[PDB]
Homo-oligomer: A and B are copies of this chain.
Amino acid sequence: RSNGTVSPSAFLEPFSASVWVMMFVMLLIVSAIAVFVFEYFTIGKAIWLLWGLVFNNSVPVQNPKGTTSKIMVSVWAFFAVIFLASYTANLAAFMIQEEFVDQVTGLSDKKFQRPHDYSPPFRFGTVPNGSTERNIRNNYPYMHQYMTKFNQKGVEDALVSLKTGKLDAFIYDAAVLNYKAGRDEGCKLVTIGSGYIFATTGYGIALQKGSPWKRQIDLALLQFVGDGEMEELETLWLTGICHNEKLDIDNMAGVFYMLAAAMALSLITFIWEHLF
């Protein structure tokens, strides 16, 4: 990613649901029942009070009548403050969580077929005379056609160039890339695949074509796997540095658009009322 990725989660709010709306409906019903009980112009004043006594009380809708009205107002205020405290706690918990899974997570979804039709030449930094290049050539030649554009050097030089210079995407061995991302300075480089692999095939020790060693070596390797050696071997050798260890202006675009739409609807309603 070019810079920090932050999700406003405007559509992930519990709004437009049947929980907060249900609680508001129940509170409104209770307030209406209390007003009807205390009753034994007024409807507009009650509606204005209910609208005001929800979020901010800095609006003149005051119309006190008696002790029952005071009691119902106090009950509504207590319910509202409890709901606001719960919502603030939920918002803090949401801010605690982070969502930085990946960017694309796909090898042949839309982009890696013909970049000329998309415009931006995403970096295709493979390496010549290897094992990944032959597979990518034998799978679909279209990607191999553009692979000749960006092919600089081994893992270190290509990673250094892609860090800030000219390259964006890098496709290479999974284990090498996992190690390189584990040992990245500042943890600013992450493989965007959510730990997904394409053509899983293990390594091996290439023996001869009939030498009397294959059976013994294979049995010894399986014995080593069973007895618990390679896990400590990798946790002592193959382990990353951080890897596993883990009021925005742009976040206000959705709520501002909703407020503008509400203002437009209010203006339309005012025009309709003035028509009659």
Query: Which A positions have Cβ atoms within 8 angstroms of B?
Result: 57-58, 92
Interface SS of A by simple majority: loop
Cβ distance A53 to chain B, nearest Cβ, rounded Å = 11
Measured CB to CB, the nearest residue on chain B to A58 is: B57
Measured CB to CB, the nearest residue on chain B to A57 is: B57
Measured CB to CB, the nearest residue on chain B to A62 is: B59
Residues in chain B near residue A58, CB distance under 8 A = 57
A-B contact pairs, 3 of them (CB 8 A): A57-B57, A57-B58, A92-B92
Cβ distance A245 to chain B, nearest Cβ, rounded Å = 17
Residues in chain B near residue A57, CB distance under 8 A = 57-58
Cβ distance A49 to chain B, nearest Cβ, rounded Å = 14
Cβ distance A150 to chain B, nearest Cβ, rounded Å = 46
Cβ distance A207 to chain B, nearest Cβ, rounded Å = 35
Cβ distance A79 to chain B, nearest Cβ, rounded Å = 16
Cβ distance A70 to chain B, nearest Cβ, rounded Å = 13
Measured CB to CB, the nearest residue on chain B to A77 is: B58
